[PDB]
Amino acid sequence: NEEPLPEGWEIRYTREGVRYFVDHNTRTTTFKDPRNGKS
């Protein structure tokens, strides 16, 4: 979404805006609905 899934932090996208973020540490970890679990 924001950062190009660099080393510092990691941002993964799935649905329209279900993406999430995960910093090197639990310091910054964005968790969105598990929409990626397309039924």
mmCIF file of all heavy atoms in Angstrom:
data_model
loop_
_atom_site.group_PDB
_atom_site.id
_atom_site.type_symbol
_atom_site.label_atom_id
_atom_site.label_comp_id
_atom_site.label_asym_id
_atom_site.label_seq_id
_atom_site.Cartn_x
_atom_site.Cartn_y
_atom_site.Cartn_z
ATOM 1 N N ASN A 1 0.840 -1.185 0.000
ATOM 2 C CA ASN A 1 0.000 0.000 0.000
ATOM 3 C C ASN A 1 0.884 1.248 0.000
ATOM 4 O O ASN A 1 0.901 2.001 -0.972
ATOM 5 C CB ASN A 1 -0.884 0.048 1.249
ATOM 6 C CG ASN A 1 -2.178 0.819 0.975
ATOM 7 O OD1 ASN A 1 -2.349 1.957 1.378
ATOM 8 N ND2 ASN A 1 -3.075 0.137 0.269
ATOM 9 N N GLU A 2 1.601 1.427 1.102
ATOM 10 C CA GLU A 2 2.486 2.571 1.240
ATOM 11 C C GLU A 2 3.922 2.175 0.890
ATOM 12 O O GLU A 2 4.403 2.475 -0.202
ATOM 13 C CB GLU A 2 2.407 3.156 2.652
ATOM 14 C CG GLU A 2 3.546 4.148 2.898
ATOM 15 C CD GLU A 2 3.013 5.577 3.014
ATOM 16 O OE1 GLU A 2 2.343 5.852 4.033
ATOM 17 O OE2 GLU A 2 3.286 6.363 2.081
ATOM 18 N N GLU A 3 4.566 1.508 1.837
ATOM 19 C CA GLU A 3 5.938 1.068 1.641
ATOM 20 C C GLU A 3 5.983 -0.106 0.661
ATOM 21 O O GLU A 3 5.096 -0.957 0.664
ATOM 22 C CB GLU A 3 6.589 0.697 2.975
ATOM 23 C CG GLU A 3 7.624 1.745 3.391
ATOM 24 C CD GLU A 3 7.088 3.161 3.168
ATOM 25 O OE1 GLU A 3 6.322 3.622 4.042
ATOM 26 O OE2 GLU A 3 7.457 3.750 2.129
ATOM 27 N N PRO A 4 7.056 -0.114 -0.175
ATOM 28 C CA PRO A 4 7.230 -1.170 -1.158
ATOM 29 C C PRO A 4 7.695 -2.466 -0.494
ATOM 30 O O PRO A 4 8.732 -3.018 -0.858
ATOM 31 C CB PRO A 4 8.239 -0.618 -2.154
ATOM 32 C CG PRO A 4 8.938 0.531 -1.445
ATOM 33 C CD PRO A 4 8.127 0.878 -0.207
ATOM 34 N N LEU A 5 6.905 -2.916 0.471
ATOM 35 C CA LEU A 5 7.223 -4.138 1.190
ATOM 36 C C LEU A 5 8.734 -4.221 1.402
ATOM 37 O O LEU A 5 9.363 -5.214 1.038
ATOM 38 C CB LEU A 5 6.635 -5.352 0.467
ATOM 39 C CG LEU A 5 5.117 -5.520 0.559
ATOM 40 C CD1 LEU A 5 4.400 -4.534 -0.366
ATOM 41 C CD2 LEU A 5 4.706 -6.967 0.282
ATOM 42 N N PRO A 6 9.291 -3.137 2.006
ATOM 43 C CA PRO A 6 10.718 -3.078 2.273
ATOM 44 C C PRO A 6 11.092 -3.974 3.455
ATOM 45 O O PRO A 6 10.340 -4.876 3.819
ATOM 46 C CB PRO A 6 11.010 -1.608 2.523
ATOM 47 C CG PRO A 6 9.672 -0.966 2.848
ATOM 48 C CD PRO A 6 8.578 -1.943 2.451
ATOM 49 N N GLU A 7 12.257 -3.692 4.024
ATOM 50 C CA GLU A 7 12.740 -4.461 5.158
ATOM 51 C C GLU A 7 12.168 -3.901 6.462
ATOM 52 O O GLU A 7 11.678 -4.653 7.302
ATOM 53 C CB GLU A 7 14.269 -4.480 5.194
ATOM 54 C CG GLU A 7 14.818 -3.216 5.860
ATOM 55 C CD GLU A 7 16.347 -3.231 5.888
ATOM 56 O OE1 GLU A 7 16.892 -3.984 6.722
ATOM 57 O OE2 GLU A 7 16.937 -2.488 5.073
ATOM 58 N N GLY A 8 12.246 -2.584 6.588
ATOM 59 C CA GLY A 8 11.742 -1.915 7.775
ATOM 60 C C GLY A 8 10.362 -2.451 8.162
ATOM 61 O O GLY A 8 10.196 -3.030 9.234
ATOM 62 N N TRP A 9 9.409 -2.238 7.267
ATOM 63 C CA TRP A 9 8.048 -2.693 7.500
ATOM 64 C C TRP A 9 7.569 -3.419 6.242
ATOM 65 O O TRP A 9 8.118 -3.219 5.159
ATOM 66 C CB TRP A 9 7.142 -1.527 7.900
ATOM 67 C CG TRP A 9 7.736 -0.148 7.607
ATOM 68 C CD1 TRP A 9 8.308 0.280 6.473
ATOM 69 C CD2 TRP A 9 7.794 0.974 8.513
ATOM 70 N NE1 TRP A 9 8.728 1.590 6.581
ATOM 71 C CE2 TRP A 9 8.406 2.026 7.862
ATOM 72 C CE3 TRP A 9 7.344 1.096 9.840
ATOM 73 C CZ2 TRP A 9 8.623 3.273 8.457
ATOM 74 C CZ3 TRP A 9 7.569 2.350 10.421
ATOM 75 C CH2 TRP A 9 8.184 3.418 9.779
ATOM 76 N N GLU A 10 6.551 -4.245 6.425
ATOM 77 C CA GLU A 10 5.991 -5.002 5.318
ATOM 78 C C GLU A 10 4.482 -4.768 5.224
ATOM 79 O O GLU A 10 3.764 -4.917 6.211
ATOM 80 C CB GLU A 10 6.306 -6.493 5.457
ATOM 81 C CG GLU A 10 6.800 -7.074 4.131
ATOM 82 C CD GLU A 10 6.427 -8.553 4.008
ATOM 83 O OE1 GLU A 10 5.286 -8.816 3.574
ATOM 84 O OE2 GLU A 10 7.295 -9.386 4.351
ATOM 85 N N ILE A 11 4.046 -4.403 4.026
ATOM 86 C CA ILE A 11 2.635 -4.147 3.790
ATOM 87 C C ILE A 11 2.124 -5.090 2.699
ATOM 88 O O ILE A 11 2.631 -5.078 1.578
ATOM 89 C CB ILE A 11 2.405 -2.667 3.481
ATOM 90 C CG1 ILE A 11 2.788 -1.790 4.675
ATOM 91 C CG2 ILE A 11 0.965 -2.419 3.027
ATOM 92 C CD1 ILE A 11 3.693 -0.636 4.240
ATOM 93 N N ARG A 12 1.131 -5.885 3.066
ATOM 94 C CA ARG A 12 0.547 -6.833 2.133
ATOM 95 C C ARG A 12 -0.903 -6.451 1.825
ATOM 96 O O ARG A 12 -1.661 -6.102 2.729
ATOM 97 C CB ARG A 12 0.584 -8.255 2.695
ATOM 98 C CG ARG A 12 2.007 -8.816 2.674
ATOM 99 C CD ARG A 12 2.347 -9.398 1.300
ATOM 100 N NE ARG A 12 1.944 -10.821 1.240
ATOM 101 C CZ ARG A 12 2.618 -11.818 1.832
ATOM 102 N NH1 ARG A 12 3.729 -11.552 2.532
ATOM 103 N NH2 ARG A 12 2.178 -13.079 1.724
ATOM 104 N N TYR A 13 -1.244 -6.531 0.548
ATOM 105 C CA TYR A 13 -2.590 -6.198 0.110
ATOM 106 C C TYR A 13 -3.304 -7.429 -0.452
ATOM 107 O O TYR A 13 -2.660 -8.343 -0.963
ATOM 108 C CB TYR A 13 -2.427 -5.164 -1.006
ATOM 109 C CG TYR A 13 -1.290 -5.476 -1.983
ATOM 110 C CD1 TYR A 13 -1.572 -6.044 -3.209
ATOM 111 C CD2 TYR A 13 0.014 -5.188 -1.638
ATOM 112 C CE1 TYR A 13 -0.503 -6.337 -4.126
ATOM 113 C CE2 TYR A 13 1.083 -5.482 -2.556
ATOM 114 C CZ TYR A 13 0.772 -6.042 -3.756
ATOM 115 O OH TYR A 13 1.781 -6.319 -4.623
ATOM 116 N N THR A 14 -4.624 -7.411 -0.338
ATOM 117 C CA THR A 14 -5.432 -8.514 -0.829
ATOM 118 C C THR A 14 -6.703 -7.987 -1.498
ATOM 119 O O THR A 14 -6.806 -7.978 -2.723
ATOM 120 C CB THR A 14 -5.708 -9.456 0.345
ATOM 121 O OG1 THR A 14 -4.525 -10.245 0.442
ATOM 122 C CG2 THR A 14 -6.809 -10.472 0.034
ATOM 123 N N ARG A 15 -7.639 -7.562 -0.663
ATOM 124 C CA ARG A 15 -8.900 -7.035 -1.158
ATOM 125 C C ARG A 15 -8.770 -5.540 -1.455
ATOM 126 O O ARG A 15 -7.704 -4.957 -1.269
ATOM 127 C CB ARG A 15 -10.025 -7.252 -0.142
ATOM 128 C CG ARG A 15 -11.259 -7.858 -0.813
ATOM 129 C CD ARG A 15 -12.452 -6.903 -0.732
ATOM 130 N NE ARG A 15 -13.715 -7.673 -0.700
ATOM 131 C CZ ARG A 15 -14.185 -8.391 -1.730
ATOM 132 N NH1 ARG A 15 -13.497 -8.443 -2.878
ATOM 133 N NH2 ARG A 15 -15.340 -9.057 -1.608
ATOM 134 N N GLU A 16 -9.872 -4.962 -1.910
ATOM 135 C CA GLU A 16 -9.896 -3.546 -2.234
ATOM 136 C C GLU A 16 -8.958 -2.774 -1.303
ATOM 137 O O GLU A 16 -8.025 -2.116 -1.764
ATOM 138 C CB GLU A 16 -11.318 -2.991 -2.161
ATOM 139 C CG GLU A 16 -11.314 -1.460 -2.201
ATOM 140 C CD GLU A 16 -10.795 -0.948 -3.547
ATOM 141 O OE1 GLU A 16 -11.614 -0.906 -4.492
ATOM 142 O OE2 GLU A 16 -9.592 -0.613 -3.601
ATOM 143 N N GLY A 17 -9.237 -2.879 -0.013
ATOM 144 C CA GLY A 17 -8.431 -2.199 0.986
ATOM 145 C C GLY A 17 -8.305 -3.042 2.257
ATOM 146 O O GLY A 17 -8.329 -2.509 3.365
ATOM 147 N N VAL A 18 -8.173 -4.344 2.053
ATOM 148 C CA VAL A 18 -8.042 -5.267 3.169
ATOM 149 C C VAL A 18 -6.562 -5.432 3.518
ATOM 150 O O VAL A 18 -6.223 -6.081 4.506
ATOM 151 C CB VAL A 18 -8.730 -6.592 2.834
ATOM 152 C CG1 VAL A 18 -8.283 -7.698 3.791
ATOM 153 C CG2 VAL A 18 -10.252 -6.439 2.845
ATOM 154 N N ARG A 19 -5.721 -4.834 2.687
ATOM 155 C CA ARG A 19 -4.285 -4.906 2.897
ATOM 156 C C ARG A 19 -3.953 -4.694 4.375
ATOM 157 O O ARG A 19 -4.791 -4.226 5.143
ATOM 158 C CB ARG A 19 -3.552 -3.856 2.059
ATOM 159 C CG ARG A 19 -3.507 -2.510 2.787
ATOM 160 C CD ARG A 19 -4.918 -1.985 3.058
ATOM 161 N NE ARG A 19 -4.852 -0.597 3.568
ATOM 162 C CZ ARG A 19 -5.873 0.270 3.518
ATOM 163 N NH1 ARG A 19 -7.042 -0.102 2.982
ATOM 164 N NH2 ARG A 19 -5.723 1.509 4.006
ATOM 165 N N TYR A 20 -2.725 -5.046 4.729
ATOM 166 C CA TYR A 20 -2.271 -4.899 6.101
ATOM 167 C C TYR A 20 -0.787 -4.531 6.151
ATOM 168 O O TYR A 20 -0.088 -4.619 5.143
ATOM 169 C CB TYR A 20 -2.466 -6.267 6.759
ATOM 170 C CG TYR A 20 -2.802 -7.389 5.773
ATOM 171 C CD1 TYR A 20 -1.787 -8.113 5.181
ATOM 172 C CD2 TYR A 20 -4.118 -7.677 5.476
ATOM 173 C CE1 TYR A 20 -2.101 -9.168 4.253
ATOM 174 C CE2 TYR A 20 -4.432 -8.733 4.550
ATOM 175 C CZ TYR A 20 -3.409 -9.426 3.984
ATOM 176 O OH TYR A 20 -3.706 -10.424 3.108
ATOM 177 N N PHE A 21 -0.351 -4.125 7.335
ATOM 178 C CA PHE A 21 1.038 -3.743 7.530
ATOM 179 C C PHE A 21 1.659 -4.512 8.697
ATOM 180 O O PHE A 21 0.970 -4.858 9.656
ATOM 181 C CB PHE A 21 1.047 -2.248 7.855
ATOM 182 C CG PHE A 21 -0.035 -1.446 7.131
ATOM 183 C CD1 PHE A 21 -0.718 -0.474 7.794
ATOM 184 C CD2 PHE A 21 -0.317 -1.705 5.826
ATOM 185 C CE1 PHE A 21 -1.725 0.269 7.123
ATOM 186 C CE2 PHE A 21 -1.322 -0.961 5.156
ATOM 187 C CZ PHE A 21 -2.005 0.010 5.817
ATOM 188 N N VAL A 22 2.956 -4.756 8.579
ATOM 189 C CA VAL A 22 3.680 -5.475 9.614
ATOM 190 C C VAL A 22 5.112 -4.946 9.693
ATOM 191 O O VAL A 22 5.912 -5.173 8.786
ATOM 192 C CB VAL A 22 3.612 -6.981 9.347
ATOM 193 C CG1 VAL A 22 4.039 -7.303 7.913
ATOM 194 C CG2 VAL A 22 4.459 -7.756 10.358
ATOM 195 N N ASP A 23 5.393 -4.252 10.785
ATOM 196 C CA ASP A 23 6.716 -3.688 10.994
ATOM 197 C C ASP A 23 7.660 -4.784 11.489
ATOM 198 O O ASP A 23 7.215 -5.794 12.034
ATOM 199 C CB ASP A 23 6.683 -2.580 12.049
ATOM 200 C CG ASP A 23 8.035 -2.250 12.684
ATOM 201 O OD1 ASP A 23 8.781 -1.468 12.057
ATOM 202 O OD2 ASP A 23 8.291 -2.788 13.783
ATOM 203 N N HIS A 24 8.949 -4.549 11.284
ATOM 204 C CA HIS A 24 9.960 -5.504 11.703
ATOM 205 C C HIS A 24 9.583 -6.084 13.069
ATOM 206 O O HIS A 24 9.932 -7.222 13.382
ATOM 207 C CB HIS A 24 11.349 -4.864 11.695
ATOM 208 C CG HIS A 24 12.485 -5.859 11.717
ATOM 209 N ND1 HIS A 24 12.591 -6.895 10.807
ATOM 210 C CD2 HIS A 24 13.560 -5.965 12.549
ATOM 211 C CE1 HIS A 24 13.685 -7.588 11.087
ATOM 212 N NE2 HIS A 24 14.285 -7.009 12.167
ATOM 213 N N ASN A 25 8.876 -5.276 13.845
ATOM 214 C CA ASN A 25 8.449 -5.694 15.169
ATOM 215 C C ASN A 25 6.950 -5.423 15.325
ATOM 216 O O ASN A 25 6.391 -4.586 14.620
ATOM 217 C CB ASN A 25 9.186 -4.913 16.259
ATOM 218 C CG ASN A 25 9.969 -5.856 17.175
ATOM 219 O OD1 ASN A 25 9.412 -6.593 17.971
ATOM 220 N ND2 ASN A 25 11.288 -5.791 17.018
ATOM 221 N N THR A 26 6.345 -6.148 16.256
ATOM 222 C CA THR A 26 4.923 -5.997 16.513
ATOM 223 C C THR A 26 4.589 -4.536 16.819
ATOM 224 O O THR A 26 3.435 -4.200 17.080
ATOM 225 C CB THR A 26 4.542 -6.956 17.643
ATOM 226 O OG1 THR A 26 4.985 -8.230 17.180
ATOM 227 C CG2 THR A 26 3.029 -7.118 17.788
ATOM 228 N N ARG A 27 5.621 -3.705 16.776
ATOM 229 C CA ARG A 27 5.450 -2.287 17.044
ATOM 230 C C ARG A 27 4.390 -1.693 16.115
ATOM 231 O O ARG A 27 3.579 -0.871 16.539
ATOM 232 C CB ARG A 27 6.766 -1.529 16.856
ATOM 233 C CG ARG A 27 7.678 -1.703 18.072
ATOM 234 C CD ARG A 27 9.106 -2.050 17.641
ATOM 235 N NE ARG A 27 10.006 -0.904 17.898
ATOM 236 C CZ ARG A 27 11.342 -0.966 17.828
ATOM 237 N NH1 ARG A 27 11.942 -2.121 17.508
ATOM 238 N NH2 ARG A 27 12.078 0.125 18.077
ATOM 239 N N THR A 28 4.431 -2.133 14.867
ATOM 240 C CA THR A 28 3.483 -1.656 13.874
ATOM 241 C C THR A 28 3.010 -2.812 12.989
ATOM 242 O O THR A 28 3.707 -3.209 12.057
ATOM 243 C CB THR A 28 4.150 -0.524 13.090
ATOM 244 O OG1 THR A 28 3.663 0.662 13.713
ATOM 245 C CG2 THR A 28 3.637 -0.426 11.652
ATOM 246 N N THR A 29 1.828 -3.316 13.311
ATOM 247 C CA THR A 29 1.254 -4.417 12.556
ATOM 248 C C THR A 29 -0.237 -4.178 12.315
ATOM 249 O O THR A 29 -1.043 -4.267 13.241
ATOM 250 C CB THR A 29 1.546 -5.714 13.316
ATOM 251 O OG1 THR A 29 1.028 -5.475 14.622
ATOM 252 C CG2 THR A 29 3.044 -5.934 13.545
ATOM 253 N N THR A 30 -0.560 -3.880 11.065
ATOM 254 C CA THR A 30 -1.942 -3.626 10.690
ATOM 255 C C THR A 30 -2.595 -4.908 10.166
ATOM 256 O O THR A 30 -2.109 -5.511 9.210
ATOM 257 C CB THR A 30 -1.955 -2.481 9.677
ATOM 258 O OG1 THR A 30 -2.168 -1.319 10.472
ATOM 259 C CG2 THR A 30 -3.172 -2.531 8.752
ATOM 260 N N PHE A 31 -3.686 -5.286 10.816
ATOM 261 C CA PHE A 31 -4.412 -6.483 10.428
ATOM 262 C C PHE A 31 -5.832 -6.142 9.974
ATOM 263 O O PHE A 31 -6.616 -5.586 10.742
ATOM 264 C CB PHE A 31 -4.485 -7.381 11.664
ATOM 265 C CG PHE A 31 -5.400 -6.848 12.768
ATOM 266 C CD1 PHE A 31 -6.659 -7.344 12.906
ATOM 267 C CD2 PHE A 31 -4.956 -5.877 13.610
ATOM 268 C CE1 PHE A 31 -7.508 -6.847 13.931
ATOM 269 C CE2 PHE A 31 -5.805 -5.381 14.634
ATOM 270 C CZ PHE A 31 -7.064 -5.877 14.773
ATOM 271 N N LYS A 32 -6.121 -6.490 8.729
ATOM 272 C CA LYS A 32 -7.434 -6.227 8.164
ATOM 273 C C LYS A 32 -8.215 -7.538 8.067
ATOM 274 O O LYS A 32 -7.636 -8.618 8.172
ATOM 275 C CB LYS A 32 -7.305 -5.488 6.830
ATOM 276 C CG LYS A 32 -7.930 -4.094 6.912
ATOM 277 C CD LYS A 32 -9.358 -4.100 6.365
ATOM 278 C CE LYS A 32 -10.375 -3.880 7.486
ATOM 279 N NZ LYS A 32 -11.597 -4.679 7.242
ATOM 280 N N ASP A 33 -9.518 -7.401 7.870
ATOM 281 C CA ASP A 33 -10.384 -8.562 7.758
ATOM 282 C C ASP A 33 -9.738 -9.588 6.826
ATOM 283 O O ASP A 33 -9.108 -9.221 5.834
ATOM 284 C CB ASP A 33 -11.744 -8.180 7.171
ATOM 285 C CG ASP A 33 -12.838 -7.899 8.202
ATOM 286 O OD1 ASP A 33 -12.837 -6.771 8.739
ATOM 287 O OD2 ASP A 33 -13.652 -8.822 8.432
ATOM 288 N N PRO A 34 -9.919 -10.888 7.186
ATOM 289 C CA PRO A 34 -9.361 -11.969 6.391
ATOM 290 C C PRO A 34 -10.163 -12.175 5.105
ATOM 291 O O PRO A 34 -10.635 -13.280 4.835
ATOM 292 C CB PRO A 34 -9.383 -13.182 7.308
ATOM 293 C CG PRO A 34 -10.373 -12.851 8.412
ATOM 294 C CD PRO A 34 -10.658 -11.359 8.352
ATOM 295 N N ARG A 35 -10.294 -11.098 4.347
ATOM 296 C CA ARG A 35 -11.032 -11.148 3.095
ATOM 297 C C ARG A 35 -10.268 -11.977 2.062
ATOM 298 O O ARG A 35 -10.861 -12.501 1.121
ATOM 299 C CB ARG A 35 -11.269 -9.743 2.539
ATOM 300 C CG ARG A 35 -12.728 -9.556 2.123
ATOM 301 C CD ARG A 35 -13.620 -9.324 3.344
ATOM 302 N NE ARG A 35 -14.886 -10.078 3.197
ATOM 303 C CZ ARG A 35 -15.970 -9.610 2.563
ATOM 304 N NH1 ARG A 35 -15.948 -8.387 2.014
ATOM 305 N NH2 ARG A 35 -17.074 -10.364 2.478
ATOM 306 N N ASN A 36 -8.962 -12.070 2.272
ATOM 307 C CA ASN A 36 -8.112 -12.827 1.370
ATOM 308 C C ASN A 36 -8.569 -14.286 1.347
ATOM 309 O O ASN A 36 -8.189 -15.046 0.458
ATOM 310 C CB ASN A 36 -6.653 -12.796 1.833
ATOM 311 C CG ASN A 36 -6.468 -13.610 3.115
ATOM 312 O OD1 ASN A 36 -6.196 -14.799 3.093
ATOM 313 N ND2 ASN A 36 -6.631 -12.905 4.231
ATOM 314 N N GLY A 37 -9.381 -14.634 2.336
ATOM 315 C CA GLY A 37 -9.895 -15.990 2.440
ATOM 316 C C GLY A 37 -11.106 -16.188 1.527
ATOM 317 O O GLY A 37 -12.073 -16.850 1.905
ATOM 318 N N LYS A 38 -11.017 -15.602 0.341
ATOM 319 C CA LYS A 38 -12.093 -15.708 -0.628
ATOM 320 C C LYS A 38 -12.757 -17.081 -0.502
ATOM 321 O O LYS A 38 -12.088 -18.107 -0.602
ATOM 322 C CB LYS A 38 -11.578 -15.400 -2.036
ATOM 323 C CG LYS A 38 -10.238 -16.090 -2.291
ATOM 324 C CD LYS A 38 -9.093 -15.075 -2.304
ATOM 325 C CE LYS A 38 -7.738 -15.776 -2.175
ATOM 326 N NZ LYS A 38 -7.197 -16.103 -3.513
ATOM 327 N N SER A 39 -14.063 -17.053 -0.284
ATOM 328 C CA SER A 39 -14.823 -18.282 -0.143
ATOM 329 C C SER A 39 -15.075 -18.904 -1.518
ATOM 330 O O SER A 39 -15.677 -19.972 -1.621
ATOM 331 C CB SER A 39 -16.151 -18.031 0.575
ATOM 332 O OG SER A 39 -16.112 -18.454 1.936
#
